[PDB]
Amino acid sequence: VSQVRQNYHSDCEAAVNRMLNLELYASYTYSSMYAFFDRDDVALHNVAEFFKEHSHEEREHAEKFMKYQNKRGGRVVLQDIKKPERDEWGNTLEAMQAALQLEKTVNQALLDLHKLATDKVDPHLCDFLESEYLEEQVKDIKRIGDFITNLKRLGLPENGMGEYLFDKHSVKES
Template identity: 35%
Template sequence: MKVLALIVLLSIAISSAHARLKCNEKSSDIPRDFLDMTRGCIKEVRRQIQAEIDASMQYLAMGAHFAKDTVNLHGFSDFFFKAAGEEREHATKLIEYLLMRGQLTDDVSNLISVNNPQKVSWANGSEALKQALKTEAKVTKSIRNVIEKCENDYNTNDYHLVDFLTGGFLQEQYTGQRDLAGKISTLDKLMATQGRFGEFLFDKQILK
């Protein structure tokens, strides 16, 4: 009984001490002079973040499809899982950019949604690569729309963001698109002469 009473007293003492030590957080009064992105431009960057996440989900579905035991083409699977990671990295870079510019003040859950991929199975690797190229072309067009908006929003040219997207993102997009186009050409030629065995060779030799 004495032990129980001692525990109760200790609990009361700890609660009282916690109440005295609790900090009342005060929001910082930060000058807003450095916030110079326009609303239209911010909206476009946020939209692009969602576009990158959607592309990542599509590539995850591709990677999972080719990893299934009934398909078992791990070259394709690894290729698409890597592509999914790259799209997530792009989304992260854009989030970090908004943070740097002081333009991300709400919860990230209000910024992005996890949408289901448009497609979850493919007849062969060529079909998947062709969809991947269409996905990349769509993302590229979306980035160009961001650049156009941020160049001309209310007669304000956001030089830094435009350079950030043009020099980094667009360069990677165009390089990736050309690589996909080359892979599609090679795979289609192999499958035209060797059929499924050509796809197998492509998976084991070229994608590895």
Template identity: 35%
Template sequence: MKVIQGILLLVAIGITNGAEAKLQCKGPHVNVPKDWITMVPPCIQKMRDQVEIELRAAVTYLAMGAHFSRDVVNRPGFAKMFFEHANEEREHAMKVIAYLLMRGELTSDVAKLIRNPMPLKEHWESGVAALKDALKLETEVTNRIRSIIMECETPQGETFNDYHLVDYLTGDFLEEQYKGQRDLAGKISTLDKMMESHGALGEFLFDKKLLKGQPV
């Protein structure tokens, strides 16, 4: 019986693949002028790499949210905050992709932008430990963005200075990164003090404030 099921499965896959092959179509080659495409190779590669960096940050925040959602941890406030951070990092990756599309530099190897990013960790001993890891993660992302800015403002071996990309990253990304880092640093300071004075109860109260969206 299992053999018959296996044969039927293979036949079904073959039929499906054949149908997909018939549905595929190739349009005529379009000769679009390339003069408007001005990004230089070092900037292109760094921006492509940034997509993976943002997605890795998003997956790490998802892991944090999942960890604090576990019944044996049960910190819904922390989970809510980290899931929100995951959405923000995913949106950042989408913004980088949109920028590459706007500049005409996403016409090939699109699948290579997403290479199964894995979270940096999956378990955290406490809320403070997770916040400290989040701050390290944001600092790494910030430094990567700054490296793109430095590379594209004066690209080595190139005469083209990409001031538009530099302005875009400085205005749209860096300010948000710096604000996020300051927010995490403040949360670490507050939670450290609360745990020093109240122990485990301090983390519990901090989590309730996060859940209600109250300032901490």
């Protein structure tokens, strides 16, 4: 047993490792989207930079779980980071739709971890999730939903001018 361990259930420790893997998976998916939008035959560089920055965010999310695990006296156990579901992402609308689904998948895993922490009466883990993960998740989901609404308004997928305009006005210029 770790000398620091107190009120930390084995099931929660394992679920934190799984959650860490999922954050790394999400990071990798966003990296793939970055590379796609940087292609010379796609060439939407503000969209590309948006996904690059989200990839970095998710890796920070993973590292925070590593630190958490050690703070509680659990042990980090790593697994393969699965490659993303797709090799090419279609266009800005398809990518944003995939990002929305990914963020909801991550959110569901966080909510499931909260239910486990609640069942094991671990208020520190509940607070960690509520204070460091759940709200930023809701914010990201809202932002991406707002983008999807605007991409549809702009006539995606068919309206190339609309897609061009989204890249200039909706995402930060990089």
